Design an enzyme around this catalytic site. Structure first.
Site, PDB file in Angstrom:
ATOM      1  N   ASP A 182       0.831  -1.205   0.000  1.00 29.88           N
ATOM      2  CA  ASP A 182       0.000   0.000   0.000  1.00 29.88           C
ATOM      3  C   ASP A 182       0.865   1.254   0.000  1.00 29.88           C
ATOM      4  O   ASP A 182       0.547   2.244  -0.662  1.00 29.88           O
ATOM      5  CB  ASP A 182      -0.942  -0.085   1.193  1.00 29.88           C
ATOM      6  N   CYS A 217      -3.776  -8.227 -12.258  1.00 26.37           N
ATOM      7  CA  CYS A 217      -4.264  -8.238 -10.883  1.00 26.37           C
ATOM      8  C   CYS A 217      -5.787  -8.167 -11.089  1.00 26.37           C
ATOM      9  O   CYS A 217      -6.491  -9.197 -11.262  1.00 26.37           O
ATOM     10  CB  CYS A 217      -3.740  -7.096 -10.051  1.00 26.37           C
ATOM     11  N   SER A 218      -6.281  -6.927 -11.132  1.00 24.27           N
ATOM     12  CA  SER A 218      -7.714  -6.656 -11.150  1.00 24.27           C
ATOM     13  C   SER A 218      -8.144  -6.058 -12.481  1.00 24.27           C
ATOM     14  O   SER A 218      -8.903  -6.680 -13.230  1.00 24.27           O
ATOM     15  CB  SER A 218      -8.081  -5.751  -9.972  1.00 24.27           C
ATOM     16  N   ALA A 219      -7.662  -4.859 -12.812  1.00 23.65           N
ATOM     17  CA  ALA A 219      -8.034  -4.207 -14.063  1.00 23.65           C
ATOM     18  C   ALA A 219      -7.056  -4.556 -15.165  1.00 23.65           C
ATOM     19  O   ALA A 219      -7.363  -4.295 -16.298  1.00 23.65           O
ATOM     20  CB  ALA A 219      -8.086  -2.678 -13.904  1.00 23.65           C
ATOM     21  N   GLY A 220      -5.869  -5.069 -14.820  1.00 22.79           N
ATOM     22  CA  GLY A 220      -4.825  -5.389 -15.779  1.00 22.79           C
ATOM     23  C   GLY A 220      -4.071  -4.198 -16.356  1.00 22.79           C
ATOM     24  O   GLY A 220      -3.628  -4.258 -17.516  1.00 22.79           O
ATOM     25  N   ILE A 221      -3.906  -3.118 -15.582  1.00 23.24           N
ATOM     26  CA  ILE A 221      -3.253  -1.909 -16.068  1.00 23.24           C
ATOM     27  C   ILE A 221      -2.289  -1.350 -15.039  1.00 23.24           C
ATOM     28  O   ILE A 221      -1.163  -0.940 -15.380  1.00 23.24           O
ATOM     29  CB  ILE A 221      -4.240  -0.813 -16.524  1.00 23.24           C
ATOM     30  N   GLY A 222      -2.662  -1.373 -13.773  1.00 24.17           N
ATOM     31  CA  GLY A 222      -1.864  -0.603 -12.831  1.00 24.17           C
ATOM     32  C   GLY A 222      -0.656  -1.363 -12.337  1.00 24.17           C
ATOM     33  O   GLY A 222       0.491  -1.182 -12.780  1.00 24.17           O
ATOM     34  N   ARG A 223      -0.931  -2.283 -11.398  1.00 23.90           N
ATOM     35  CA  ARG A 223       0.136  -3.175 -10.948  1.00 23.90           C
ATOM     36  C   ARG A 223       0.726  -3.936 -12.111  1.00 23.90           C
ATOM     37  O   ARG A 223       1.924  -4.208 -12.129  1.00 23.90           O
ATOM     38  CB  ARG A 223      -0.400  -4.162  -9.920  1.00 23.90           C
ATOM     39  N   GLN A 261      -1.034   3.204 -13.590  1.00 24.10           N
ATOM     40  CA  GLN A 261      -2.275   3.958 -13.436  1.00 24.10           C
ATOM     41  C   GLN A 261      -2.134   5.147 -12.505  1.00 24.10           C
ATOM     42  O   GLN A 261      -2.911   6.068 -12.614  1.00 24.10           O
ATOM     43  CB  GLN A 261      -3.368   3.019 -12.908  1.00 24.10           C
TER      44      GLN A 261
END
Length: 282
Positions: A182, A217-223, A261
Site C-alpha cells: 500500500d 491483478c484486477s483491471a490489468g493496467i496498474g500493478r 495507473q
C-alpha cells in the site's frame, strides 16, 4: 513516443523528486479506448470495469468456442510488447470474474502461455480477482487443469499446474505475488524485484520463442503495468546500461491504455530500478 534516458546517478535522484515525477507522469496520455469501439450486446458482463477496455489493434481474440460470435470471442486482454519492441511477450488482462473464468483458461490454452503472474493480495481475493484455479482439478471447455504442487516462498506462492485437453498435456507456472505494498516506498521494492527476476529466469527456461506471459491483478493496467515496465527496464539496464522508464511507459500504453495507473506506481517503478542498479554495481 516520449523518452527520458536515465543513467545511474540521474536514476537515483529522479526516484527522489516527486515534483518532477508528477510533472512527467501527468503529461503521458492514457490512451484509453472509446467504449463505442465495442457496441456489442452483453459485453459489459465480460468486463470487470466498464471503462477499461482492450485497445483493438492489440487485443487477444478467443477462437473458442465460436470464432464467428463477437461475444464469445471477446476477452479483456491485450498483447504487450517486450524490450526492444519484441511482439507478444506478455498479455495484460483483467482478473477473471465468475463469468469469464472459462474464457481465461481458453486464452491460456490457445496462447500456450507457460507463466501467469498474478499481483493480488490475499486480502483482496474474490473482490479484485476470482479464485480461478482449483484446489486439485477442474475442467473448463475441454481443458483439464490440475494443480500438481504449491511452493510457498516469502514473496509469492508458485503453483505448478498441468493442463490436459484430449491427447495434449502442458505445464504452467502460476506465480501469485502477495507482497504488493500500500505504501510504495523503497523498503517495499525488493520483493517485486525478486518476482521480476524469478519470472525472467523461468521465462528463459522455456526456451526460444517463449509464448506470451500473462500478467494481471484486477483491471490489468496498474500493478500489471508496473510489473511489465520493471521487467522491460531490467533488460534495458543490463543491456544498455541505462533505463528509459518514460519511453517504456509510452510503449506499454500504446499496447494497452492506462498501463501504470497512478503517479505512486510510476515512482515505485523508479524505486525498483534504482534498487536494481545498485545491486548490479555490487
Amino acid at each position: 513516443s516520449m523518452s527520458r534516458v536515465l543513467q545511474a546517478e540521474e536514476l537515483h535522484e529522479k526516484a527522489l523528486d516527486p515534483f518532477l515525477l508528477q510533472a512527467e507522469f501527468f503529461e503521458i496520455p492514457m490512451n484509453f479506448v472509446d467504449p463505442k469501439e465495442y457496441d456489442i450486446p452483453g459485453l459489459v458482463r465480460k468486463n470487470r470495469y466498464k471503462t477499461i477496455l482492450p485497445n483493438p489493434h492489440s487485443r487477444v481474440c478467443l477462437t473458442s468456442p465460436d470464432p464467428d460470435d463477437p461475444l464469445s470471442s471477446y476477452i479483456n486482454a491485450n498483447y504487450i510488447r517486450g524490450y526492444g519492441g519484441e511482439e507478444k511477450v506478455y498479455i495484460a488482462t483483467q482478473g477473471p470474474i465468475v463469468s469469464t473464468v472459462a474464457d481465461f483458461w481458453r486464452m491460456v490454452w490457445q496462447e500456450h502461455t507457460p507463466i501467469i503472474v498474478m499481483i493480488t493480495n490475499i486480502e483482496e481475493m474474490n473482490e479484485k480477482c476470482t479464485e480461478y484455479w482449483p484446489e486439485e482439478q477442474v475442467a473448463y471447455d475441454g481443458v483439464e487443469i490440475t494443480v500438481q504442487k504449491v511452493i510457498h516462498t516469502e514473496d509469492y506462492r508458485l503453483r505448478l499446474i498441468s493442463l490436459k485437453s484430449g491427447t495434449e498435456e502442458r505445464g504452467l507456472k502460476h506465480y501469485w505475488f502477495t507482497s504488493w505494498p500500500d505504501q510504495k516506498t523503497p523498503d517495499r521494492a525488493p520483493p517485486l524485484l525478486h518476482l521480476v527476476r524469478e519470472v525472467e529466469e523461468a521465462a528463459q527456461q522455456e526456451g526460444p520463442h517463449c509464448a506470451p506471459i500473462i500478467v494481471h491483478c484486477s483491471a490489468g493496467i496498474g500493478r500489471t503495468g508496473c510489473f511489465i515496465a520493471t521487467s522491460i527496464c531490467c533488460q534495458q539496464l543490463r543491456q544498455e546500461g541505462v533505463v528509459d522508464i518514460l519511453k517504456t511507459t509510452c510503449q506499454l500504453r500504446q499496447d494497452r491504455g492506462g498501463m501504470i495507473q497512478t503517479c505512486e506506481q510510476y515512482q515505485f517503478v523508479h524505486h525498483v530500478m534504482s534498487l536494481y542498479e545498485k545491486q548490479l554495481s555490487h
